[PDB]
Each structure stands twice: as C-alpha cells, then as structure tokens.
Amino acid sequence: PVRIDNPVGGFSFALPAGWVESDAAHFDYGSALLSKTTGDPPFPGQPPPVCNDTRIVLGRLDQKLYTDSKAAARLGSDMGEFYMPYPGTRINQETVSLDANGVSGSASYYEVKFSDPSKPNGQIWTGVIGQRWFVVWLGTANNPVDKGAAKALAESIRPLV
Amino acid sequence: PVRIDNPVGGFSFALPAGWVESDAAHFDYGSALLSKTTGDPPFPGQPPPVCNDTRIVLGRLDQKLYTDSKAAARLGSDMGEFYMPYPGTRINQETVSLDANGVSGSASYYEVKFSDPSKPNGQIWTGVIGQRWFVVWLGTANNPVDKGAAKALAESIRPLV
Amino acid sequence: PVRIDNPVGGFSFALPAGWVESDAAHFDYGSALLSKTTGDPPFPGQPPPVCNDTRIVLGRLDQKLYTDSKAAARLGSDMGEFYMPYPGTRINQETVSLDANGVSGSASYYEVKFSDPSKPNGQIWTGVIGQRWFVVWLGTANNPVDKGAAKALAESIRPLV
Amino acid sequence: PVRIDNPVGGFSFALPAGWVESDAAHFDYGSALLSKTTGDPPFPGQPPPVCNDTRIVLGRLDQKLYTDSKAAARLGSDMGEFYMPYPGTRINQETVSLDANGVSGSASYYEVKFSDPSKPNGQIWTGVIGQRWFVVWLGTANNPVDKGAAKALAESIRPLV
Amino acid sequence: PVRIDNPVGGFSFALPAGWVESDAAHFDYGSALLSKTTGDPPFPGQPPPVCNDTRIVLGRLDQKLYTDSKAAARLGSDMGEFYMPYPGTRINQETVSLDANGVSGSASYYEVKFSDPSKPNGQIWTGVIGQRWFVVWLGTANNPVDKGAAKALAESIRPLV
Amino acid sequence: PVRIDNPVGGFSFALPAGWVESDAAHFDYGSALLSKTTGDPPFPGQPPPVCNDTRIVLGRLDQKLYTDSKAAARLGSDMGEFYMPYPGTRINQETVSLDANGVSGSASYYEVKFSDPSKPNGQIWTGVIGQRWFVVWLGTANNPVDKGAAKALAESIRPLV
Ligand SMILES: [Hg+2]
Ligand SMILES: [Hg+2]
Ligand SMILES: [Hg+2]
Ligand SMILES: [Hg+2]
Ligand SMILES: [Hg+2]
Ligand SMILES: [Hg+2]
Numbered sequence: 019p020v021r022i023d024n025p026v027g028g029f030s031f032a033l034p035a036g037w038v039e040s041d042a043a044h045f046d047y048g049s050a051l052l053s054k055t056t057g058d059p060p061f062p063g064q065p066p067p068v069c070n071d072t073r074i075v076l077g078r079l080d081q082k083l084y085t086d087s088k089a090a091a092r093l094g095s096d097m098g099e100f101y102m103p104y105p106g107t108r109i110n111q112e113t114v115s116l117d118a119n120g121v122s123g124s125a126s127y128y129e130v131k132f133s134d135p136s137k138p139n140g141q142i143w144t145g146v147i148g149q150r151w152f153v154v155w156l157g158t159a160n161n162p163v164d165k166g167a168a169k170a171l172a173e174s175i176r177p178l179v
Numbered sequence: 180p181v182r183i184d185n186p187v188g189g190f191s192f193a194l195p196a197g198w199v200e201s202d203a204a205h206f207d208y209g210s211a212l213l214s215k216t217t218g219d220p221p222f223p224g225q226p227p228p229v230c231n232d233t234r235i236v237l238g239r240l241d242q243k244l245y246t247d248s249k250a251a252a253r254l255g256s257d258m259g260e261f262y263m264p265y266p267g268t269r270i271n272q273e274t275v276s277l278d279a280n281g282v283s284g285s286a287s288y289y290e291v292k293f294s295d296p297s298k299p300n301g302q303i304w305t306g307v308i309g310q311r312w313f314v315v316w317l318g319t320a321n322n323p324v325d326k327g328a329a330k331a332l333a334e335s336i337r338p339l340v
Numbered sequence: 341p342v343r344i345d346n347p348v349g350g351f352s353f354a355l356p357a358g359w360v361e362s363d364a365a366h367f368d369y370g371s372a373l374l375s376k377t378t379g380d381p382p383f384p385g386q387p388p389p390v391c392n393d394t395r396i397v398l399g400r401l402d403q404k405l406y407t408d409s410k411a412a413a414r415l416g417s418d419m420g421e422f423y424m425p426y427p428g429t430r431i432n433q434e435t436v437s438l439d440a441n442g443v444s445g446s447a448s449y450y451e452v453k454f455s456d457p458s459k460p461n462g463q464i465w466t467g468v469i470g471q472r473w474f475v476v477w478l479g480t481a482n483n484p485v486d487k488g489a490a491k492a493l494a495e496s497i498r499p500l501v
Numbered sequence: 502p503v504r505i506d507n508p509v510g511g512f513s514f515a516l517p518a519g520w521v522e523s524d525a526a527h528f529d530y531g532s533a534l535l536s537k538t539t540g541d542p543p544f545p546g547q548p549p550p551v552c553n554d555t556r557i558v559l560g561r562l563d564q565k566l567y568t569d570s571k572a573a574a575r576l577g578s579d580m581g582e583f584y585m586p587y588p589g590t591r592i593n594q595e596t597v598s599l600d601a602n603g604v605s606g607s608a609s610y611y612e613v614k615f616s617d618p619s620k621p622n623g624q625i626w627t628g629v630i631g632q633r634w635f636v637v638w639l640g641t642a643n644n645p646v647d648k649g650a651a652k653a654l655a656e657s658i659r660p661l662v
Numbered sequence: 663p664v665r666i667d668n669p670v671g672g673f674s675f676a677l678p679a680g681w682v683e684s685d686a687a688h689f690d691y692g693s694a695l696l697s698k699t700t701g702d703p704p705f706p707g708q709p710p711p712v713c714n715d716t717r718i719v720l721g722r723l724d725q726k727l728y729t730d731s732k733a734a735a736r737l738g739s740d741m742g743e744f745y746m747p748y749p750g751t752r753i754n755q756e757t758v759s760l761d762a763n764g765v766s767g768s769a770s771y772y773e774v775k776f777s778d779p780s781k782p783n784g785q786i787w788t789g790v791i792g793q794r795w796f797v798v799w800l801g802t803a804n805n806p807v808d809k810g811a812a813k814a815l816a817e818s819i820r821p822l823v
Numbered sequence: 824p825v826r827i828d829n830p831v832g833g834f835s836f837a838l839p840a841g842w843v844e845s846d847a848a849h850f851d852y853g854s855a856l857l858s859k860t861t862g863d864p865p866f867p868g869q870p871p872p873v874c875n876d877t878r879i880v881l882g883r884l885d886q887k888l889y890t891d892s893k894a895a896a897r898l899g900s901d902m903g904e905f906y907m908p909y910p911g912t913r914i915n916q917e918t919v920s921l922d923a924n925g926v927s928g929s930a931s932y933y934e935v936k937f938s939d940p941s942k943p944n945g946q947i948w949t950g951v952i953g954q955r956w957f958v959v960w961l962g963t964a965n966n967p968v969d970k971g972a973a974k975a976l977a978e979s980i981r982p983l984v
Contacts, residue, residue, distance in 0.1 A: 020822075022669050025344050026360055038670055039690035046361035047377075049385045055691075059724040061586065061744065062737065062796055063693045067553045080381040092266075093384065099264035100383065103257045103544065152384055178342075181983075183830050186505050187521055199831055200851035207522035208538075210546045216852075220885040222425065222905065223898065223957055224854045228392045241542040254545065261544065264383065313545055339503075347666050348682055368683035369699075371707045402703040415706065418908045422705065425904035427897075474706055500664075508827050509843055529844035530860075532868045563864040576867065579747045583866065586743035588736075635867055661825075705908065714872045747866065 024050055025178060027078040029151050032174035034167050037074065038066060049077030054161075071138075072157040073101075074171070079150040086146045087113065087124040094126035094144030097154050102140040106132035109139075114165070116147055118173045123147035125172065127165065145172035185211055186339060188239040190312050193335035195328050198235065199227060210238030215322075232299075233318040234262075235332070240311040247307045248274065248285040255287035255305030258315050263301040267293035270300075275326070277308055279334045284308035286333065288326065306333035346372055347500060349400040351473050354496035356489050359396065360388060371399030376483075393460075394479040395423075396493070401472040408468045409435065409446040416448035416466030419476050424462040428454035431461075436487070438469055440495045445469035447494065449487065467494035507533055508661060510561040512634050515657035517650050520557065521549060532560030537644075554621075555640040556584075557654070562633040569629045570596065570607040577609035577627030580637050585623040589615035592622075597648070599630055601656045606630035608655065610648065628655035668694055669822060671722040673795050676818035678811050681718065682710060693721030698805075715782075716801040717745075718815070723794040730790045731757065731768040738770035738788030741798050746784040750776035753783075758809070760791055762817045767791035769816065771809065789816035829855055830983060832883040834956050837979035839972050842879065843871060854882030859966075876943075877962040878906075879976070884955040891951045892918065892929040899931035899949030902959050907945040911937035914944075919970070921952055923978045928952035930977065932970065950977035 020033040027048025040051040052075075053068035060066045084092050091113070098108075108128045116123035125145035132140065138159040145153040145168065153175070155168040181194040188209025201212040213236075214229035221227045245253050252274070259269075269289045277284035286306035293301065299320040306314040306329065314336070316329040342355040349370025362373040374397075375390035382388045406414050413435070420430075430450045438445035447467035454462065460481040467475040467490065475497070477490040503516040510531025523534040535558075536551035543549045567575050574596070581591075591611045599606035608628035615623065621642040628636040628651065636658070638651040664677040671692025684695040696719075697712035704710045728736050735757070742752075752772045760767035769789035776784065782803040789797040789812065797819070799812040825838040832853025845856040857880075858873035865871045889897050896918070903913075913933045921928035930950035937945065943964040950958040950973065958980070960973040 020669060020672060025342060026355065028342060033670065038692070042364035042686035042690055043387070044385070046364055047387050048360070051385070059726050061740070062723060062727065063688070063695070063719040063721055063798070065687070065691050070550045075385040077385055079384060082381050083384065095266070096264045096383070099260040103260035103264075105253075105256070154385070181830060181833060186503060187516065189503060194831065199853070203525035203847035203851055204548070205546070207525055208548050209521070212546070220887050222901070223884060223888065224849070224856070224880040224882055224959070226848070226852050231389045236546040238546055240545060243542050244545065257544070315546070347664060348677065350664060364686035365709070366707070368686055369709050370682070373707070397707040399707055401706060404703050405706065414910075417910070418705070421904040421908035425901045425908075427900070476707070508825060509838065511825060525847035526870070527868070529847055530870050531843070534868070558868040560868055562867060565864050566867065575749075578749070579866070582743040582747035586740045586747075588739070637868070711875045 022050070023178060024048060024077070027151070028149060028178055029078065030176050030178055031076060031171060034074070034171055038068070040068070040073070044077070049075060051075050069161055072161045074153070074155045076153045076171070077151065079146060079148070079152040081150070084146070085124070086122065086148065086150070089150070090124045090144050090146040091126045093146060093152060093154075094128070094142060097144055098128070098130065098140070098142045101142065101156050102130050104132050104134060104137065106130040106140070114145075114169055116145055116169065116172050118147045118175045121147055121175075123172065125153075125169065127163065143168045145169070147172050147175050149177065151175050183211070184339060185209060185238070188312070189310060189339055190239065191337050191339055192237060192332060195235070195332055199229070201229070201234070205238070210236060212236050230322055233322045235314070235316045237314045237332070238312065240307060240309070240313040242311070245307070246285070247283065247309065247311070250311070251285045251305050251307040252287045254307060254313060254315075255289070255303060258305055259289070259291065259301070259303045262303065262317050263291050265293050265295060265298065267291040267301070275306075275330055277306055277330065277333050279308045279336045282308055282336075284333065286314075286330065288324065304329045306330070308333050308336050310338065312336050344372070345500060346370060346399070349473070350471060350500055351400065352498050352500055353398060353493060356396070356493055360390070362390070362395070366399070371397060373397050391483055394483045396475070396477045398475045398493070399473065401468060401470070401474040403472070406468070407446070408444065408470065408472070411472070412446045412466050412468040413448045415468060415474060415476075416450070416464060419466055420450070420452065420462070420464045423464065423478050424452050426454050426456060426459065428452040428462070436467075436491055438467055438491065438494050440469045440497045443469055443497075445494065447475075447491065449485065465490045467491070469494050469497050471499065473497050505533070506661060507531060507560070510634070511632060511661055512561065513659050513661055514559060514654060517557070517654055521551070523551070523556070527560070532558060534558050552644055555644045557636070557638045559636045559654070560634065562629060562631070562635040564633070567629070568607070569605065569631065569633070572633070573607045573627050573629040574609045576629060576635060576637075577611070577625060580627055581611070581613065581623070581625045584625065584639050585613050587615050587617060587620065589613040589623070597628075597652055599628055599652065599655050601630045601658045604630055604658075606655065608636075608652065610646065626651045628652070630655050630658050632660065634658050666694070667822060668692060668721070671795070672793060672822055673722065674820050674822055675720060675815060678718070678815055682712070684712070684717070688721070693719060695719050713805055716805045718797070718799045720797045720815070721795065723790060723792070723796040725794070728790070729768070730766065730792065730794070733794070734768045734788050734790040735770045737790060737796060737798075738772070738786060741788055742772070742774065742784070742786045745786065745800050746774050748776050748778060748781065750774040750784070758789075758813055760789055760813065760816050762791045762819045765791055765819075767816065769797075769813065771807065787812045789813070791816050791819050793821065795819050827855070828983060829853060829882070832956070833954060833983055834883065835981050835983055836881060836976060839879070839976055843873070845873070845878070849882070854880060856880050874966055877966045879958070879960045881958045881976070882956065884951060884953070884957040886955070889951070890929070891927065891953065891955070894955070895929045895949050895951040896931045898951060898957060898959075899933070899947060902949055903933070903935065903945070903947045906947065906961050907935050909937050909939060909942065911935040911945070919950075919974055921950055921974065921977050923952045923980045926952055926980075928977065930958075930974065932968065948973045950974070952977050952980050954982065956980050
C-alpha cells in the first residue's frame, strides 16, 4: 500500500498497484496524472513503458466549478468530451456511491460506442469526493477501467492537515 | 510575410502576424501549435507573454482520418469537444470554401453558447486543404477568431517538395 | 493553511493562498518558484492561468553567499537587477524585521520608478531568515507585492529535521 | 520522399516512411533521434504513439572519435553496449558497403542473443558515411531492423552547403 | 543529515552532502538521479553547476529483475556497459557487504581501464539492499566514487510505511 | 561555415565554430541561445558538455524596444544587469561599428570588476544590426568574449525573404 501526498491540492491518496506518476508537473497545481505500466520492466533507473489507452487524473475540484452526485455526472460528461472527442453513443451507464473514510461522494461511469466501428469502445469513471476532490479513470474495451480499483482509489483520498 | 517549413508534415505556411510558435515538439510529428502575443514585449531573448484564450493548430491530416467539406465539418465537431468540453449550444455556423494556390479545401466555423452564463462564448474555425492538411483556430467572444486571417493561413499552405 | 516541504533546501513553508508552484525542478536543488493564479479556473487536471507580472522565489541561501539585515539588503539589490534590468530609480524603500518561530531575520523592500514612463513601477521584497533561507516576492504597481503576506511567508519557514 | 535538414550537424537526410522525430533537442547539437509510429493515428495535432523497442539515431561523428569500415564496427560495438547493456552473444554479423551519392562509407550489423531466454534478441545496424556522419538503427526480433531501409537512410545523407 | 522520501519506489534515503537531485521525473516511477555540485554557488534560486563525470542513480529494483551478492554483481556489470560503453578492462574489483538498519545487501565495485589512453579510468559502485533497492554511483579517476559515502548512502535506505 | 535560419525572427546567421544551440524553444519566438562546447566529445547522439560561464543570445529586437549606437549601449547596460546582477564597476568599455552585408549597426562592450574579489571579471558584448536584430555574447576573464568572433556573428546576420 503506497500513499502519495499532494500538498498543493490538499490531499493524499493510495497509488493503484501497477501505476506510476506520468509527470511531476501536475503536482505543482494540486493534481496528479497516473499511467499504467505494461509489466515489461525497463533498465533500472529508466522510465517504464506504459499503456497509451488508459490514464488516471485526480486533484482538487475547484469550489468555483460544478451535490457530489450531480457534480460527478457533469464532470464525467465534460471529461468524456475532452478525452474521447469522437462521435458516439453513451452506453452501460452506472453511478456509484463513495465513502472515503466517512467523507461521502459519488461517481459516474459510462462507455462510449463510437460511430467509427474500428475504434474500441471508450470507458470513463469520474468520482467526486467531499473541499472536494475528483478522480477520473479512463480506459477502453481493450484496457478497461477497473471499477473496483477506481472506487478504492477515490475512497483512499484523505485531506492533508 | 514569414514562411515556416514543417518538413515532417510535408508543408509550409505563412505565420500570422502577431503569432509565435508555442513549442518546438509539435514539429517533430508534422504539426504546429501557435500562440498570440499580447503585444507587451518581453526582455530580449525571453519568451513573450501570450493570450491564454486563443490558439492555432495545424498539421498533416492523416489519410486514415476523416470530401474536404465533410472532413472539415467532422474535424471541427471533434475539435470543439476537445478544446471546449463544456455543455452548450452551437450557433452562428458558417462554412467557407478554400483555395490554397489552386488546392481546394473547405472550412467549418461555429460559436458555442455555453450553459454557464459566466463563460464567454467559444469560437472555432476548422479548415481542411487538399495529401491533406488541417488548420484549427480557436478563440472566444473576448478574443475572437479572425476569420479572414484563418482563411489566409489555410490558403497559405504549400506542399514541400 | 497548506505546508510544503523542501527537503533538499532543508525547510518547509506555508503556501500563500491563491499561489501554486511554477515548476517542479526548483525543488531539485532546494528552491521553490511560485506563481499567482488568476482566479479563472482551468479544466480540472489542467494547469491554471497565472499572472505574468508577479512571482515568488524561495530557498536555502548558500553559506558562501552574502547580519541578516545586511544580507537581505544586498540580496534585494541583486534580485532587483536580475528581475528588473531596466534603468530607473529606487523609491519607497522599507526594511522589515522578521521572526520565524523565534528565528530572526530581516527583509528589504523597494519600488522602481523606471525611466520608461510606460512601464509600471516595479516592486520587490527580499527577506533572509536564519543555516539561512531567502524569500523574494516580485510585483508591479498593477500587481503589487502583498507585504503582509510576504512577511507571513518568510515567518512561516521552519527547518526540517 | 521527405528531406530533413540538420544545420548544426552539417547534413540533410531522407526521413524513413512511418518514422517521426522523437524530440527537438537532438538537432541543437547536430544529431537526430527518430521513433517509429505504431500506425494507430492520434487525435490531429497530438503526438502519435510510437514503438518502444526500435529507434534510430543519426548525426555528425566527431573528428576526435573513432577507415569508415573500422569506425562503423567500433561504433556499433559501443552502441550495442549503450542500448543493449545485458549479457549475451553476438550472432548473425554482417558488414555492408555504403555509397551516399558518391561518398563512401560502411556499416556493421549484428544481433544479440541474450543470456535471459525471455528477452527477444536485440538487433543493431551502425553506419558511418564520409567530415563524417553516423546512423544507428536499433530493433529486436519482434521489431526488426529494416536493413534495406537503414542502408537507404545512410545513403540519403547529403552535406549541407 | 537530509532525508528524502521516494514514495513511488517505497523508500527514503539520506542525500549525500554536496549532491542535489538532477531532475524531478525520476521520482515519478520510483527512482532518483543525483548530481554533484561543483561548489561554485549559483545566483539564488537558480540551478547550481554540477559535475558532468559523476552521477548517482537509486531506486526500487524490480522483483522481475536479477542473492543480493549475485544481483549487485550482475547489475554492476550491466550498469557499466550502459554508462561506460567503450572498450576496456575491468580492474581493482571489490565487493562490499551492506547492512541498512538490519536489512542486508551487497555491492560490487570496479574500475575500467579504457583502450583509449586519453580517457580517464571509469569507476562504478553498484549496491543492492533487501522488496529490494539499488544504488549506482559512477565516477572517474578525476572524480572518483567515494566508496565510504556510497556505502553510507545504500545503508541509509529505509522502507516507507 | 554553418548557416542557421530563424524564420520566426526573420533572420539567418553563421553559427560560431565550437558552439551549439542550447535549446530549441528560443526559436519558437524568434531568438536563439548558443552554448560553447568544452571540446571533450560526448557519446555519439548525446548532448555535448558546454561551458557554464559563457553564452550567446541573438534575435529580433522588438520595434517597441530601444540610432543603433544608442540602442546597443542601452541594451548592453540592461543585459549586463540581467546576466551579471552583482555589484561592481564597468571598465574597459568599447564601441564597435558593424556592417552586416551593408546593413549598419553598432555594438557596445564592457567588463565588470565585481565588488567580490573572488568573482572573475564579467565581460559582455552587445550588438544591434538594422527591422533590427541583436547579438549578446557573455563571458568572463576565465572564458573571455571573443570580440572578433562576436563582430563576425553580428555581421553574418541576413534578413530572410
Ligand atoms: Hg497496455
Ligand atoms: Hg490576450
Ligand atoms: Hg494577473
Ligand atoms: Hg510497435
Ligand atoms: Hg566537477
Ligand atoms: Hg568551459
């Protein structure tokens, strides 16, 4: 169990097994971007290969932006445009209640069946917890969102004091 | 009149007056990203301040991706999701014929009236010319797309030989 | 109240409200560079717009370099050349005693009236606390140094053990 | 046919089909690093996915460093240590004469059978042409060096005047 | 005594006196790269000049990769190819037992006498401790590995919990 | 003789022998930053070691900013504050007439004797040619400005058409 502090964003979280940070700059402004290692280890000290069709973003959710249920739905809709900007239809929608050590939240999940029959279906899970924090886990039919792990990641969020 | 070569993307173009390149890395894979200087000059040798609500992207349009009229409409719809991922309504739509030294193309323009009444309206102009190249010019009601300059930029595109 | 550790520089500090880290690399060698958000929030996970006419630098002050009163005056004079390299006259000078949880220091403030009548006046506040640490807060007549917040930032410095 | 100038390194070359530049910084000091696109196109304007098990480096070969036949063999031996630092045996060695528009050179190729039976065999082709320039094309049994294309790349090198 | 946490790699370590972090990105995936300051201090807030012929890398050693004695020897052999890819002979070999607060490990050291008589001899110290962590300290005859400090660095490693 | 184009800044120039570009980003906005190699060659394809006490900046000189004689003196005074922000006295001043293929300009040179007796004297040469372009060559008593080469660099500037 690996806990990561994000002091600018005011929270800590548990790093999902098999994931690394994608860059350092997100932490400058209170966010975090994570990538999934492929499992093939790099030479020691060098950066590991990571998947290009899945990613996780988390951070403080600005008080100016966006109930946690309504917020996660709205954020999830916007995130899906930003990360999956191709025409398609939303299918297999779900909402999930969150409880991060007693701090309530909500998440919205859905899949995108793209108009392009050669594109794998997109998948997106967006959680809001709470001061408020968000978690977005993006994947595809070939590299699916791990819904149980996304819930565990959001429920691992703790405010820093 | 400043002409810029993009050898990986197979084209050259005229840099719009008052704009600079935003980074060098786009040219690595045959694209270009431009930013608009604010007019307040920096110390010599240092990077100029640029606007944060307008941008231009141009590059080779992959033969796998997307008539030029249909292509610019589809690309413009996707670009507007990617750059303006908030809910809203498309208004003030236009299409524009392009002629780049005899190479035909088409562009699609529209504005977005956002659901959020405090967001300025978004503006996007997307052109496809042609091997094919694209031009996307993004702005807002406070920093509008210069439609005549966007047409001139797309019509300035020349294949490199 | 957000406390940030800088382990290479041997100190922690309280992040001023409304400010973010400008990059990650400063911490590699025991410094920190901060930028002021404009208040217009970015899309979640993306970097916020920041002001281009104000900045804060802090870090360990090398034992080889530069009383804390004399040190802050000398450092402030050099910092003003580095950040405001245009001809002008220093006006509205002040010195300020510092007490960081019992660790004494001193700061030097002044404004620059530039020879160029179209340049807004520059403002710089430079503090030395203490092992020694420095704080430099730069602004202009349009985006002034918050002198009370600069004193609070310097007095928030704690050695790490 | 896409020709790329490298003014600091004093040469131009033909970009192999399906390859892009990996970064811009190599050109600062007269080299070039190329990566192979996977074929899955990115969103327009965004960087394409590239293979992680093949790469090409080319540049001016310092007059202080390293006949072209002896030079390519020595450089190839060193490059194979640098890029394939695991124990193994060199097999399937070849040397290839080069003629770049009348400028002679030589290349050395070999494969590495690694001690680790789960590692795919490494492949490396190293050419020296000539002022002198080098070309290194690295691959594996799963993503082999295209020997004909590596020879064409080295023979495409032209001095800039 | 300066202790640095590496949460992705699951460890903390004591920063050797006179060394700084070379970049921030290594920590993204659980490694750290350190550079040695030259002693000439930079302007405050700016990065210090560092030596170009010595470096330290440390990180988690993948369970898939590589007894600690055998592991450090094998890793040291591979690291010496990666960092010193020129022909030469290994001389002055040593192995060193490690004890990091009761966690055992081993290190392998050797020097390289290069075929090129104008190259200074290379030096490399590679330690494995332990979950397992590695430490590599690289130097030359002109800027030698500090063997006592490398042992202290490896023995300063503590798992994070 | 190596000529480099800077299309955003509207000029080309001859690269001084032994110098490389320091980064790619300066060209994005019409400037160039050059560093001096130490002569010790790197491994092929890797960046060469460069001096840390000398540098060259060149670029378009904004029509809003700053006769060429008065301009070079004023720019040289400001550049010396920016690059040598320590107290001292200007000595050994010179001005130099420039003629870049018939385009006139002027340069201002001076040395700085620092108050700190352990700092080597600073040296700065600043030229303005002309649309106008600037050249700044910075050095020290240990790594002096090559005045003849700085004049040749400024006189090598040609407008791009
Ligand atoms: Hg994957
Ligand atoms: Hg603007
Ligand atoms: Hg501002
Ligand atoms: Hg591949
Ligand atoms: Hg050194
Ligand atoms: Hg030097």
